[PDB]
Design an enzyme around this catalytic site. Sequence first.
Site, short mmCIF file in Angstrom:
data_model
loop_
_atom_site.label_atom_id
_atom_site.label_comp_id
_atom_site.label_asym_id
_atom_site.label_seq_id
_atom_site.Cartn_x
_atom_site.Cartn_y
_atom_site.Cartn_z
N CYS A 1 19.11 -17.09 -3.80
CA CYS A 1 20.33 -17.83 -3.52
C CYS A 1 21.48 -17.20 -4.29
O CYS A 1 21.60 -17.36 -5.50
CB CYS A 1 20.16 -19.29 -3.92
SG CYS A 1 21.65 -20.31 -3.74
N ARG B 1 -20.87 -37.86 4.28
CA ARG B 1 -21.82 -36.78 4.47
C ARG B 1 -22.14 -36.26 3.11
O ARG B 1 -21.31 -36.33 2.22
CB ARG B 1 -21.21 -35.71 5.32
CG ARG B 1 -20.96 -36.18 6.74
CD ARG B 1 -22.26 -36.63 7.38
NE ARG B 1 -22.14 -36.79 8.82
CZ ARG B 1 -22.08 -37.95 9.47
NH1 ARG B 1 -22.10 -39.13 8.84
NH2 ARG B 1 -21.95 -37.92 10.78
N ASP C 1 2.67 -10.96 -11.09
CA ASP C 1 2.84 -9.76 -11.87
C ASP C 1 2.36 -9.84 -13.32
O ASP C 1 2.25 -8.80 -13.97
CB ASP C 1 4.31 -9.33 -11.79
CG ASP C 1 4.66 -8.79 -10.43
OD1 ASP C 1 4.24 -7.61 -10.14
OD2 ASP C 1 5.36 -9.50 -9.66
N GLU D 1 3.19 0.39 -7.78
CA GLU D 1 4.44 0.76 -7.07
C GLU D 1 5.40 1.53 -7.94
O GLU D 1 5.96 2.51 -7.51
CB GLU D 1 5.19 -0.49 -6.58
CG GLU D 1 4.61 -1.15 -5.35
CD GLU D 1 5.38 -2.37 -4.96
OE1 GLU D 1 5.65 -3.19 -5.86
OE2 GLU D 1 5.73 -2.50 -3.77
N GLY E 1 -25.01 -26.69 -12.84
CA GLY E 1 -24.59 -26.84 -14.21
C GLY E 1 -25.67 -27.38 -15.15
O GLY E 1 -25.49 -27.37 -16.37
N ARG F 1 -13.62 -40.00 6.41
CA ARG F 1 -14.87 -39.45 5.96
C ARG F 1 -14.78 -39.12 4.50
O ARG F 1 -13.72 -38.70 4.04
CB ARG F 1 -15.23 -38.18 6.71
CG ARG F 1 -16.73 -38.09 6.88
CD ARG F 1 -17.27 -36.72 7.17
NE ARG F 1 -17.37 -36.44 8.59
CZ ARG F 1 -18.18 -37.04 9.44
NH1 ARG F 1 -18.94 -38.06 9.05
NH2 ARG F 1 -18.21 -36.65 10.70
N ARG G 1 -14.70 10.45 0.87
CA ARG G 1 -13.33 9.92 0.93
C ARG G 1 -12.91 9.40 -0.40
O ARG G 1 -13.65 8.72 -1.10
CB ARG G 1 -12.96 8.88 2.03
CG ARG G 1 -12.97 9.49 3.43
CD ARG G 1 -12.20 8.63 4.41
NE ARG G 1 -12.14 9.27 5.75
CZ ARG G 1 -12.56 8.73 6.90
NH1 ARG G 1 -13.01 7.48 7.01
NH2 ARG G 1 -12.46 9.45 8.00
N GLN H 1 -24.31 -19.18 -7.44
CA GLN H 1 -24.36 -18.00 -8.30
C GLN H 1 -23.37 -16.90 -7.87
O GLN H 1 -22.95 -16.13 -8.71
CB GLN H 1 -25.77 -17.45 -8.45
CG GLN H 1 -26.54 -18.29 -9.45
CD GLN H 1 -28.02 -18.07 -9.37
OE1 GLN H 1 -28.52 -17.23 -8.61
NE2 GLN H 1 -28.75 -18.89 -10.11
N1 LIG Z 1 21.63 -14.46 -13.94
C1 LIG Z 1 21.54 -15.43 -13.03
N2 LIG Z 1 22.46 -16.40 -12.96
C2 LIG Z 1 22.35 -17.37 -12.02
N3 LIG Z 1 21.36 -17.42 -11.11
C3 LIG Z 1 20.40 -16.49 -11.08
C4 LIG Z 1 20.44 -15.40 -12.07
N4 LIG Z 1 19.39 -14.60 -11.82
C5 LIG Z 1 18.71 -15.14 -10.76
N5 LIG Z 1 19.33 -16.25 -10.33
C6 LIG Z 1 18.90 -17.09 -9.21
O1 LIG Z 1 17.48 -17.03 -9.22
C7 LIG Z 1 16.99 -16.67 -7.94
C8 LIG Z 1 15.66 -15.93 -8.05
O2 LIG Z 1 15.81 -14.77 -8.87
P1 LIG Z 1 14.98 -13.44 -8.55
O3 LIG Z 1 15.54 -13.00 -7.20
O4 LIG Z 1 15.09 -12.58 -9.79
O5 LIG Z 1 13.50 -14.08 -8.38
P2 LIG Z 1 12.28 -13.86 -9.42
O6 LIG Z 1 10.99 -14.35 -8.79
O7 LIG Z 1 12.76 -14.28 -10.78
O8 LIG Z 1 12.05 -12.23 -9.47
P3 LIG Z 1 11.79 -11.22 -10.75
O9 LIG Z 1 10.45 -11.68 -11.33
O10 LIG Z 1 11.72 -9.86 -10.11
O11 LIG Z 1 13.03 -11.36 -11.63
C9 LIG Z 1 18.11 -15.86 -7.35
O12 LIG Z 1 18.02 -15.95 -5.94
C10 LIG Z 1 19.35 -16.51 -7.89
O13 LIG Z 1 19.77 -17.56 -7.03
#
Ligand SMILES: Nc1ncnc2c1ncn2[C@@H]1O[C@H](COP(=O)(O)OP(=O)(O)OP(=O)(O)O)[C@@H](O)[C@H]1O
Lengths: 733, 732, 83
Positions: free
Chosen positions: A74, A641, A151, A249, A560, A552, A186, A650
């Site tokens: 957002c 049931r 992550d 990545e 255990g 149901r 492979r 296991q």
């Molecule tokens: N510095 C900030 N100030 C205000 N809002 C923020 C800020 N950073 C992120 N947001 C809000 O948090 C949302 C999610 O952030 P992001 O896109 O980093 O998701 P995330 O899962 O935290 O990813 P990552 O782990 O890569 O940082 C953004 O879409 C934004 O609306």
Amino acid sequence: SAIGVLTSGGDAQGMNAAVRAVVRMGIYVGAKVYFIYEGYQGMVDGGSNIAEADWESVSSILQVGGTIIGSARCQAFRTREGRLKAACNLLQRGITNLCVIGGDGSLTGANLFRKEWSGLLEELARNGQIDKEAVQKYAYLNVVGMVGSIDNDFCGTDMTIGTDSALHRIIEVVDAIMTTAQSHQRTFVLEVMGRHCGYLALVSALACGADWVFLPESPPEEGWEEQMCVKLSENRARKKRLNIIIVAEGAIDTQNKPITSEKIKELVVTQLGYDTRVTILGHVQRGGTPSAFDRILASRMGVEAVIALLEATPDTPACVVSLNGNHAVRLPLMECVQMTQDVQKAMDERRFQDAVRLRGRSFAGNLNTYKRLAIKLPDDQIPKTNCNVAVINVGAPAAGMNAAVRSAVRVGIADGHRMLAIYDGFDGFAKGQIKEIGWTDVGGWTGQGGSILGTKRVLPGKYLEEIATQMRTHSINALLIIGGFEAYLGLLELSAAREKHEEFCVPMVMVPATVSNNVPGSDFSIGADTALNTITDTCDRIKQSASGTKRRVFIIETMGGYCGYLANMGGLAAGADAAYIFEEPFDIRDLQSNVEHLTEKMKTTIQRGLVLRNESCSENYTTDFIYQLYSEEGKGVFDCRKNVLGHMQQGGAPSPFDRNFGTKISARAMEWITAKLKEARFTTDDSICVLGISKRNVIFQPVAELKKQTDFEHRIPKEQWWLKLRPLMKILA
Amino acid sequence: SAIGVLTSGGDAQGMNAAVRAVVRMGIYVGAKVYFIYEGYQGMVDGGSNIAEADWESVSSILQVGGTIIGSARCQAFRTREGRLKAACNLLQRGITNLCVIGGDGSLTGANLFRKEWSGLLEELARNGQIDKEAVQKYAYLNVVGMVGSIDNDFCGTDMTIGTDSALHRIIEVVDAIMTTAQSHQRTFVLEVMGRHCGYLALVSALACGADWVFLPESPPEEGWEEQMCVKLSENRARKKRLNIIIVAEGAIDTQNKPITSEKIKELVVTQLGYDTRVTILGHVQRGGTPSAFDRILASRMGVEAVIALLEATPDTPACVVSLNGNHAVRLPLMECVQMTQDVQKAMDERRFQDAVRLRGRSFAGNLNTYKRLAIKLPDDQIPKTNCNVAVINVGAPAAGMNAAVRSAVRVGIADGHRMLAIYDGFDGFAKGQIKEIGWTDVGGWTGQGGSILGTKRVLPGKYLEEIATQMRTHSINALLIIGGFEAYLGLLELSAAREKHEEFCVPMVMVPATVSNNVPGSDFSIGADTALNTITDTCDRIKQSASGTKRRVFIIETMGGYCGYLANMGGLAAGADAAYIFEEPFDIRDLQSNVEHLTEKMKTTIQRGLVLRNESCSENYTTDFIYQLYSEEGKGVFDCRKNVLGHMQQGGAPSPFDRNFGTKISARAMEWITAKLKEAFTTDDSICVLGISKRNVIFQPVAELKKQTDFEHRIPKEQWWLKLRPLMKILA
Amino acid sequence: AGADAAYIFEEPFDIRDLQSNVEHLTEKMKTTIQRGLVLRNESCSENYTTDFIYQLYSEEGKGVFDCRKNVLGHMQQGGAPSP
Ligand SMILES: Nc1ncnc2c1ncn2[C@@H]1O[C@H](COP(=O)(O)OP(=O)(O)OP(=O)(O)O)[C@@H](O)[C@H]1O
Ligand SMILES: Nc1ncnc2c1ncn2[C@@H]1O[C@H](COP(=O)(O)OP(=O)(O)OP(=O)(O)O)[C@@H](O)[C@H]1O
């Protein structure tokens, strides 16, 4: 007050269970809880993106990936104009308690929003809201965060919600692909997620015994191209029919240049000529079902989050909720956001050893263990003791046994012992089924279920004279047992037999493996996670089939023995309405009351029920008894049931957690053995031990010291850490 | 009398079971069997790449992907130099009976090799062979082939070993990914295998109700780019939260130019702006565990292959072993290789309708069905009858039910009826729980387990008057029941009630859905495959346990009621040592004999045992009885454990076979309904079961099935799979 | 009681022994004494229970005879002691 909960950022498996725990605990404690849909976007739009949540609104959510309420990058929330609207919409419904489930940035923006929250003074200066509401809904915005991410990105937290699940996805693909790589030979290069964090790549590589792995935190070091190809050719000379290379990545060389999977394919094709394929796993890693671990983790956190919110005062800084050493903790949010950015900084500035420290001690652990088992120094360079060390499996088969044996053996050979494999537990031991075992002999084992060496519950007390003879004949200098309560008893019998037999006057250590998790001196045992996932897996399929009529209720018996761990935790993960266990006595009044609860529950829209029963929880109140009670008292309302799960629990293949638990703790056990052997050139309580997990860390506890902590009659520990969770199931149902 | 078996080409799940069946059947019939490792490469190298196989060498192989003995593109075998060596090495050990398990090209090269086999005349002309060995090991090379391939590539065969398994892998990914396409409105382009054959892509698309699919055999037709994007935007206007586009590796436009997944991403991103991702599934599709279907298919074929080899004479041409209409057949190999190349030729020469015919009738079926359910003509263009047709579910929940309802509904709306959904079986029917249902209302259903409409075993006989009233009130012109034996009984009751109630004088047809597979008039039922796969999974784990402990035998009770289908076929797929069922009486002598066999088996290295017992197979010889027998007679040798699975072994989400079986046969049923309505009170032939009988699907009047039915045990009298009983004893 | 068999712990019996008594009683049913009586000591065998034997006999008798089972129970302590 009122609590708003939203999911922002990349989605992770287990977000749904968190939301569920927050709604249920919030209502249980008599707060009102609102959903905020679409992460911060819902907060900005307001209107129907904010909707009060009832009990029923978060049922059937538990077992489902992603978020039922939505995430959303957002942008508007990155602007004061956007944050102004957000505050306006929160005050519009009285929400000053905020629970943000998301990732590193989501949490970063929540931290910012708390700080600016006296931007209600701005809304005052316009038509936003009344003067006194700047005081009522005061500058006290109470913010608590939970990290949802595959992550293991964030620094406050030992584990992030979604890692285990994603790792299941990764290993599901790796196990699948292994069979097509044997046929064909492979070499497979697989590209896993981790643009900035290598945790997932590392723990995958460990869980599949990968032949090489690339992390951004720990680049290869110059002259790895030769060094890798030497290892792969050694493998073909060992007649290993495939290679698996795992690549994050964001993999990089020591000057931050990318190492792509296509670049690895070309190196292997060019230098060695092997047939080679690349797979880019992609968004599958966010998909599928939440593992038991993530469901129970998310559940514990949702509850703690809601507690942290209510206990908060305007003085207490915003916190992030985490499980560190299996205990709930609050960490300051600002400081946690800061430390995560530091890691990225260290890498950008080529301080890689720093980046690894900053990730934590456990990250260095996985890494270092991986190296020991992946690369062998040529026999010339490992000198070492003329000690024979034996490995054995005792008790029922438990998923992870094979991984543990592979680890012990390799670590022992690395340490320069001769490793002896003892077949069929103490049965084989007595019958001298003993043979030396090597590095290659345990290749391929990590992901094998059951016990290749073979396991038996039989105890050694009747065969001491025969067993001692074999220790003499084979000059056994030390012993490593991987097994359950029977293994523990085995150590106690051998300990006592030391006076009568010198041959037992050596170091012996055990690592716990059993689906039951009933070995004293460890909070966890190798194989229990696999069975939890099997139970959870099974309940998911049960809810899936026969959706329509409902009314149901299913009574399901779990393994255990007298240990309630599986019944309890699987009950949590499966969202069971009850889990009957030995460790909490229940009478007919207790049963009749659950029945009356489920009878009222059938008036709601969630017209289903699920009841688990530990197999030895009560001599009189059997699985049939409970099935019959519920059936009869439900006659107008529902039917039942019954399923006795049985030996499937296991496992087929061990879950990633059991593989890496097996691998890591068996290696720590061998380290201890070699250190004890080094001290000679010799027998007391402290040379016979269980190595288990106690709260924060792993410790070697003498069997003598565990007798008093043990219930021998029911073969469980006296204090068991997970009994403190019992209130959760009642609350969250 | 020696047999060589090898695996060549792309590996496929189920190859191991085939090898197992060939070695076990070969030995059972007293032949010697040699492994040839690494496909034709092993044959070229000779030496220790050829090695005799014992009974024990193919245990623990069944449940494992790929091939334990290896495949290998072998270029050398494409050259006479290479084929000369191969013959030399075969003769060097006396092997002139050859079983080649592999794909399109593998079998093409076997065919070539048979023809050239009097290239022993060349080896004679050098030092290869003694003169008389050109005569002994004569020009008589006896070749039998089995198609192992995920592609359903070959023309002789209705199904190739590995397709079902690969399709499980595909749909596992699709079902996994669906939950992450939740968040936002992501559109996923997935690249499946099928470089020349579109079968896998088509059957995937069908099994996940995909929004679009690209096949080499049936290109898009010009102006599809707009037409696709119109469909995707319609979906977002229907509030569907994701799109799934399935793309065969060898997809093409009508001028043979490739259609790549990256090209589709750019079209969707460019035109519609949606957030879009590409996934190249890759070699996962060859991985994982053989599905029950592939294990049983492979097993049946390994056995027939070995039979075909021994019955062969120097007269009989080389053949390929296949299951056509669920029956083992030999087809001439040469002609089969030829026809497969023809398909490729038709495509190369832009005769695409030809390419589809040449693939076969079932290929056209999947395709044509897919179109009907994927694309809807705007309401304006579908005119049609003012007929209300009702859909209902009767009997226990069965995986596939929801797919079937989705199909019936959409096909009926396409045919221009108004579709009525009847809730909770005849319960709801009597209580008038009836509501009209639409195209979008059944969106997302294909992969849903259970019954969304709701099902009940209750029969209609006690509620005829109430039910008739609802048929009048809602002007129900015809009825489609999807369900088990209870649905069959429901049709019989309504049939009899026709005289008393005019409202039932309409066409009624049923399609069989039950885990049990006990509906008369069909060899298969929607949901049985899903349960088989669950039992198989479960038995695999159980043996894994038994092998860890050693000297253990498990007795496991399975569902089906009196129907032994699940016990028997799950027994085959799990490699069970025995499966006791109602349909084959067994006495104490039969039990004691299996006990004695397992007691000798414990002297080998496979010190485990697995015994299944159908839940209602004998009133006296219960699960406990058998556990006690085995336990007591095994006292010095092994022990036992018992598990009663319980009805959880039905599993959850329907398997791909049950989704597409549900989808296809429910559509065929609606076709029949509309055709009956178009012809306009009625007779035996307007009340039917539509089931699968041997080769083809047929509408059989319920009146004709009474005599074929055991009403006391609720199973059919003749059941096709009883002819497989010898297999389990042999292959154990 | 003139029983046709009495199974006891002190004399081990196997499935062959049982099958042979069953075959004897099956031939006995061709004579005019078409009845049978089998006693089983309560702890004579852990696997061959009262039910097991009932089930064996019932099944192998299907064309010839049927069975009933009675577990005598605590009545055997007696009402009044015998002289
Ligand atoms: N510095 C900030 N100030 C205000 N809002 C923020 C800020 N950073 C992120 N947001 C809000 O948090 C949302 C999610 O952030 P992001 O896109 O980093 O998701 P995330 O899962 O935290 O990813 P990552 O782990 O890569 O940082 C953004 O879409 C934004 O609306
Ligand atoms: N025309 C041919 N002549 C001789 N041998 C062939 C021929 N075509 C294929 N082969 C053999 O089969 C191997 C390749 O089979 P291919 O790569 O076509 O796999 P397949 O699995 O049998 O078919 P598909 O490619 O449709 O899955 C080659 O290594 C070669 O040994």
